[PDB]
Amino acid sequence: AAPILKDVVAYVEVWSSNGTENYSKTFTTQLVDMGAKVSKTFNKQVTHVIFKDGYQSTWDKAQKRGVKLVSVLWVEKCRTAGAHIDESLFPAANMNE
Numbered sequence: 126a127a128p129i130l131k132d133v134v135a136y137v138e139v140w141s142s143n144g145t146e147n148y149s150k151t152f153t154t155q156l157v158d159m160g161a162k163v164s165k166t167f168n169k170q171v172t173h174v175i176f177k178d179g180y181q182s183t184w185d186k187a188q189k190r191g192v193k194l195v196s197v198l199w200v201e202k203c204r205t206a207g208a209h210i211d212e213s214l215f216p217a218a219n220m221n222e
């Protein structure tokens with residue numbers, strides 16, 4: 126238990142593929158448990174977007190703003206490893222890209 130993600134300002138959009146269930150609160154709690162700040166809005170302070178089947182607007186903005194765009198598996202791997210894992214190993218997916 127350590128604030129290994131203390132430098133992360135995360136914006137989270139993690140949904141079921143069919144867009145009926147929003148799991149963003151789950152992953153927000155896991156990030157905050159690791160010391161991260163999680164912002165409710167995707168503002169200029171955000172350094173990381175954790176993305177699963179989120180809005181296309183979010184996907185485009187993350188790519189165009191050059192933020193770290195990661196899958197949920199990155200959150201699970203930081204937790205189980207207890208370390209800030211390299212985000213380039215966990216690129217997010219978007220089935221419509």
Ligand SMILES: [Cl-]
Binds near residue numbers: 140141142143
């Ligand atoms: Cl799903």
